């Protein structure tokens, strides 16, 4: 059975040329397959890009035909996608496939002019009106980082129950933001300590943020 493995640069800038490689195992690309490139946008919509055939024949999506080139190297059993003049809208996960029978695991590609930047981490403070003997919520806002991903844990991994870490959103600034929250007993506030551990490997940033109630006295 055919096996496919995508590789790519991960990040490219607007106007540049994207180049992806698909390494094929278990089958030869000179046999009767349509070697497809397909991409999946954030939001999960799928788009067929084009294919190359056993004899080097190609077919492209007319919407991309002016920017797309699919080629191959039969000697190392690979084929390639070249996408010119990319913009942020070409950000997607790119798959290669044998027809549509078998797909690779895909390579995530981001197009952006943004510079590497570690997150600012802000507290989502527990409300001082949390229902007594009830449940409180607190969290961390992980704002303005690039590129993805960040990781978030609570109490160095010891706190996992009730945690929700939301998917990142891309802001109009070109930087990402996400929140991570947790629900805990109201009676635990001020006796238990809550710390969010945020790691952003692309910038070698590590931040531990203790989340506390905000001071409610007018005089403090």
């Amino acid at each position: 059975e055919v096996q496919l493995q995508e590789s790519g640069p991960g990040l490219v800038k607007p106007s540049q040329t994207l180049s992806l490689t698909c390494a094929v195992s278990g089958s030869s690309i000179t046999y009767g397959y349509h070697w497809n490139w397909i991409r999946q946008f954030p939001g999960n919509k799928l788009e067929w890009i084009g294919y190359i055939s056993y004899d080097g024949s190609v077919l492209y999506n007319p919407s991309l035909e002016n920017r797309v080139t699919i080629t191959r190297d039969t000697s190392k059993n690979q084929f390639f996608l070249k996408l010119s003049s990319v913009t942020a809208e070409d950000t997607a996960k790119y798959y290669c496939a044998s027809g549509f029978d078998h797909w690779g695991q895909g390579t995530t590609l981001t197009v952006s002019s943004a510079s590497t930047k570690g997150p600012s981490v802000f507290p989502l403070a527990p409300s001082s009106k949390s229902t007594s003997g009830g449940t409180a919520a607190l969290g961390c806002l992980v704002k303005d980082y690039f590129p993805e991903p960040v990781t978030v844990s609570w109490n160095s991994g010891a706190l996992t129950s009730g945690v929700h870490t939301f998917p990142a959103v891309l802001q109009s600034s070109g930087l990402y933001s996400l929140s991570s929250v947790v629900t805990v007993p109201s009676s635990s506030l001020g006796t238990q300590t809550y710390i969010c551990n945020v790691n952003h490997k692309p910038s070698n940033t590590k931040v531990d943020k203790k989340v506390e109630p905000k001071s409610c006295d007018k005089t403090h």
């Binding site: 999960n44 067929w48 999506n61 549509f100 895909g106 989502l124 919520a137 704002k143 939301f166 409610c216």
Partner: protein, 219 residues
Amino acid sequence: DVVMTQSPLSLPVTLGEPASISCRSSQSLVHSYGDTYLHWYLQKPGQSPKLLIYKVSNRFSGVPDRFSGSGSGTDFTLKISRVETEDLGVYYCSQNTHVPYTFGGGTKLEIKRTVAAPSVFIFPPSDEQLKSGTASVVCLLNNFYPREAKVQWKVDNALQSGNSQESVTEQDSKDSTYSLSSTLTLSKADYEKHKVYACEVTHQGLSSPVTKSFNRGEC
């Protein structure tokens, strides 16, 4: 381009019970040489699509017997006789009869459960963030079902538009609920123009909209 339309957008299912989803094309998918190149896939989070049914009704090698496709021309249907946990995910249809080859928008199968109203929390911007010149106001909707939920921001009772973003979690593996974050983003200067910040939440589990609010500076 041939438009592929899948419905429903999401289908609540129960383990051990049947499921049925539809795929419709803007024109016939019959190819000039007789075959109908209509296929069905299943995709799980972070994973690539996997072929289930090819050419309308043919089970791909390895696919369980409980899967079956049918239909013709412009109307197609995938059926599961008895839904299993492994069948949860997003189902896609595609066509390569006509160039360009096109995909449907997907149909998610989610676990059905009892209605659960969200717990609602509002968080003001931290003083730390404010010193930096921006104000993020966050509204949390915790552990609700079903997915459908409306969050409206009101600033001094003026409804906000065009300045917020929402994110949602995947359905929880333990209790089959969703959680949702809504972030209202303002410059420090705009934030300081107003006093009352509220998020109003509407959901099937709430007999009346829930509002959580705070006054800028208190606490």
